[PDB]
């Protein structure tokens, strides 16, 4: 399948080179997979989600996304125009309030929720969780991320936006999950992207167009935006049967574009998520 004039991130994920604008992907498109977006929620009524999005949990007085961040992220995972996995099922877990803030205890609870809740969902091709959030190092937060992964969920987490080593952030520093740095459309490490040995992969994160609340769209930037590219990629690869929740981060690293990013600090992986799709 070919989607012309796609957001640059989508085009990049299916390309061996920067500077193209068509997104190429197998038409299976993550059908039969599920992706949990653990964030400010998802505006499920957005036309871009086509009925494939649902709020399953909130820790606040509403499950509505009163922010937009969670909706943007979900849109990159699986919206029809802005998504990597255009046929995946999207589940929203609101651990962040409408200011984008959340106590670590609520974040942990949301992770443990998804680890159980996948048993209440129909996801024959496999389960992914996208966590575009973080804060300072916490062993409890990392442990929760490690549980969710161990349970059979491909966990993708943002490296963080401090232009700093991600070892000092959580869940970014958890070894057993997929930690995702950000790049721009010129294959530069995004200026705000964290780095370090704990990173597993890079995805597009600068100037990323996706869904927003009020049924709109916008371009914003962050390792928050890179993460859902990787989560969507994992869902897509799982429906194709190429990989599984346990091995998908390795598989993505294995099949990544290698050595192509600039301003990657010494000792950080130079790997850019790539679907290796041959149209
Ligand atoms: Ca990791």
Curated annotation (Swiss-Prot):
Q: Which pairs of positions does the record mark as disulfide bonds? A: 34-123, 178-249
Q: Which UniProt keywords apply?
A: Calcium, Disulfide bond, Hydrolase, Metal-binding, Protease, Serine protease, Signal, Zymogen
Q: Which GO terms describe its molecular function?
A: metal ion binding; serine-type endopeptidase activity
State its Enzyme Commission number(s). 3.4.21.64
- Keyword Disulfide bond in annotation: yes
What detail does the entry give on cofactor binding? Answer: Binds 2 calcium ions per subunit.
Binding site residues for Ca(2+) 1: 175, 177, 200
Binding-site list for Ca(2+) 2 = 16, 260
The annotated active site, in chain numbering, is: 39, 69, 224
GO biological process assignments: proteolysis
Per its record, the protein catalyses:
Hydrolysis of keratin, and of other proteins with subtilisin-like specificity. Hydrolyzes peptide amides
The answer, when asked if Hydrolase is one of the entry's keywords, is yes
Cofactor requirements of the protein? Ca(2+)
Q: Which GO terms describe its cellular component?
A: extracellular region
| Superkingdom to which the source organism belongs | Eukaryota
Domain Peptidase S8 positions: 7-279
- Summarize the protein's role: Hydrolyzes keratin at aromatic and hydrophobic residues.
> In which family does this protein belong, per the annotation?
Belongs to the peptidase S8 family.
Protein's name in the database: Proteinase K
